[PDB]
Amino acid sequence: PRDCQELFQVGERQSGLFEIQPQGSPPFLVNCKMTSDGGWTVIQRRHDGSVDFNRPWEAYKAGFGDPHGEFWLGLEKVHSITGDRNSRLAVQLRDWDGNAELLQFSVHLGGEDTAYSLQLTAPVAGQLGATTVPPSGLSVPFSTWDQDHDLRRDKNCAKSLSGGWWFGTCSHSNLNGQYFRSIPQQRQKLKKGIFWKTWRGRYYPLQATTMLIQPM
Numbered sequence: 001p002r003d004c005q006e007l008f009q010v011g012e013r014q015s016g017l018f019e020i021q022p023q024g025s026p027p028f029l030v031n032c033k034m035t036s037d038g039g040w041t042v043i044q045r046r047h048d049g050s051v052d053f054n055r056p057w058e059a060y061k062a063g064f065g066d067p068h069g070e071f072w073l074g075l076e077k078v079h080s081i082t083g084d085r086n087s088r089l090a091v092q093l094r095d096w097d098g099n100a101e102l103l104q105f106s107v108h109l110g111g112e113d114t115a116y117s118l119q120l121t122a123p124v125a126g127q128l129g130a131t132t133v134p135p136s137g138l139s140v141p142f143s144t145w146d147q148d149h150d151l152r153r154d155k156n157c158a159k160s161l162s163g164g165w166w167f168g169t170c171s172h173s174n175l176n177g178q179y180f181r182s183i184p185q186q187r188q189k190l191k192k193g194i195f196w197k198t199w200r201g202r203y204y205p206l207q208a209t210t211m212l213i214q215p216m
């Protein structure tokens, strides 16, 4: 099977770890979530701060963490699953009162020659808060502290925050920031946290996150 949806299509019902082999890729073990709307590959999961997410480009490219716990699957693995296909990206957020927020967006994902850019249509960029986007859409590269794409020579978004992310601004979201259980001395620490601005605010540290992908 090339991905979790293929595993779903052959009849696999259980969520857990399964071997897949995308076109052109070696085989590798992924976390599949089997739902009534098909098979989803889990590409990121955070829930307790046990895994360090402040890593460089090569780690975000290859993947890191605990497949039975918190992890980042790895951009090269994710792009091997998506290829050039239109894909559903599910973003799941949990706050410290147990509320969950479930978002889904249609995306394309470029390969490493695009710095693994998230390619959004203008309506999808609008869903994310962008107001003036041309029909050609928006491309946002991935950035880490050692490979940051902020054009301002004065600035480095990943270094000023924490982790690796599609920093379209430095103020929209970062689900790969530093895990916090409480309010740090200043918004100076929470600035480097796990946030999604339009749900709980720029400096609310989220309790748990999951990101999932389903090509087509």
Ligand SMILES: CCCCCCCCCCCCCCCC(=O)O
Binding pocket: 089, 091, 105, 107, 118, 125, 128, 129, 130, 140, 166, 167, 168, 169, 170, 171, 172, 173, 197
């Ligand atoms: C598309 C799925 C979401 C996950 C990745 C989102 C990364 C950011 C890309 C969206 C750019 C929107 C810019 C809004 C700017 C802002 O409010 O600061």
